[PDB]
Nucleic acid binder design. Sequence first.
RNA 1: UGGGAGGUCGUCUAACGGUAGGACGGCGGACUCUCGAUCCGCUGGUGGAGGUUCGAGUCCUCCCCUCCCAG
Lengths: 239, 249
Amino acid sequence: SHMWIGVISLFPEMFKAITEFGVTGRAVKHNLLKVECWNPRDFTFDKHKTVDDRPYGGGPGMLMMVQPLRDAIHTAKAAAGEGAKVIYLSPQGRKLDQGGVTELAQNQKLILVCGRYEGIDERLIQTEIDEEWSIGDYVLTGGELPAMTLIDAVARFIPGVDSFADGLLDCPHYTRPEVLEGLTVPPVLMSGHHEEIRKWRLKQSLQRTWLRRPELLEGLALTDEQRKLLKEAQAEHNS
Amino acid sequence: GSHMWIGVISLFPEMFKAITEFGVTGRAVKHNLLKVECWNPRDFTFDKHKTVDDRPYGGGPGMLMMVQPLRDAIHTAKAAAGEGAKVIYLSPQGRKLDQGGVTELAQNQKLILVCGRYEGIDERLIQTEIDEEWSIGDYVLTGGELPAMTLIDAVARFIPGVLGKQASAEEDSFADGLLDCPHYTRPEVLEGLTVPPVLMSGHHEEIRKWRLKQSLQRTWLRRPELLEGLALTDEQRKLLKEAQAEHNS
RNA sequence: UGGGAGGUCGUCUAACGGUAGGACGGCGGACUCUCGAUCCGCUGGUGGAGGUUCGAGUCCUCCCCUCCCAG
Ligand SMILES: Nc1ncnc2c1ncn2[C@@H]1O[C@H](C[C@@H](N)CC[C@H](N)C(=O)O)[C@@H](O)[C@H]1O
Ligand SMILES: Nc1ncnc2c1ncn2[C@@H]1O[C@H](C[C@@H](N)CC[C@H](N)C(=O)O)[C@@H](O)[C@H]1O
């Protein structure tokens, strides 16, 4: 099985950033992931290929023009066939987190609408969009980076391609040399005992989650081992 | 004129064309309002195999970035940037980015962004070369390039002259700490839905109040937590109260 | 529907008793853009009757509608 992602964007070339590079790029070459794009501009019918328009009530800025965007969405929705969910990238949507990523991952086909300018017509959101998703509480100039972020995150779940895995931040990592700028690698990682290492790393993940993002610890049911190790870390932090 | 410089450390510098050749950010670059320079650790690898990943102690998942190429790239960039440059590591273990953080980061004249790949980077490079760690969200990506581009884009909207003449009236979410109001454009009736008459009224004061009320109502219904510590005018309190009543009962 | 005040394009704002303008909106067009930028046309008004005056947005009367002050 593979993942198919439809994208509606005025700047499809931006998507090369994920399709021609890294793990996701490798995913594309092996046909494990396909990303098809439709450009509202290819759907205009005028001399200047207009894809934006003025918002009613005046004031500055522009919105994406309704017709080209709509036609692109219907065309993409068509090509996608039955069962394809249309998602609009927006700061007012559901904030992405690992749970949202896994849910989005269930879907076999998705179509991602990338806004530009001041956004899209509200009626298109009500009539064509199934779900709105935000990548964070901040505003960007467009939805392409958010779309690629979502794609990359879900792409990690495609067969043949873990922090947050258990609700915890990842542990610290080390590689050669044994000593770097007077800093030595914790002896336990070189001890070669898989069990001592596993326990040390788990304790570190727990300590970091507690110290940097302690709130990520309310919704979890720690195992006896996790509760014990966390208890130890808190004792070490301020004795 | 207004200018900002962003140094980037990345194995895939070409990814950055996504924010430098396109849109508002592309024009900002084309007008020298925003400058992005990229150093690639692969160009600093002694390894004859242009190898940039090394094995993690303890065995485990994946590979880590090789220390020497990454370190040399960071020192070269830091040296080129000169003094006063803040070094940031993109990582999910970092401070979660939000609009307040974007304004704060936007307070820097020079920044260097380190983009990880594979399982990440040696913790000691973080302790010795990194000033701050930032995450774009509670989810895991294959690399720091998208997060870096996200950070750059987010701060770029705040560089004067980027959006154009009087961007102070340009409306986006979080700009004033509230979510944006809904927007409408031509045609007047599509898929049975009509544009709210007030926006066609030409009545300026009512439109200002409508927009403000919509922003308050939408923020209240979708992200009420933002409303927890917000300085508000008498008018916003009144308008918000009207909206809360209107939906309830 | 008691006592005050007031009516000009859709909105805001001008005009001595002398040919009713401007800004924004709305419609449409140029930039030759990826311009969330900037320009340019077109649309459109004195609430209604009387009366004074050579002439009324302006002054007088009545009618209507609107705001403020206690139903
Ligand atoms: N936090 C975000 N998450 C996902 N997409 C975003 C985010 N911020 C901006 N975008 C995209 O950027 C496009 C252009 C934005 N300037 C529009 C913002 C819109 N006016 C709002 O505040 O809701 C939006 O249509 C979205 O597609
Ligand atoms: N949410 C995020 N915010 C910022 N950077 C991220 C995010 N997710 C992944 N990255 C970066 O992209 C790469 C992700 C992977 N290397 C895995 C990282 C590993 N889980 C860690 O704990 O660092 C690293 O460079 C991360 O710093």
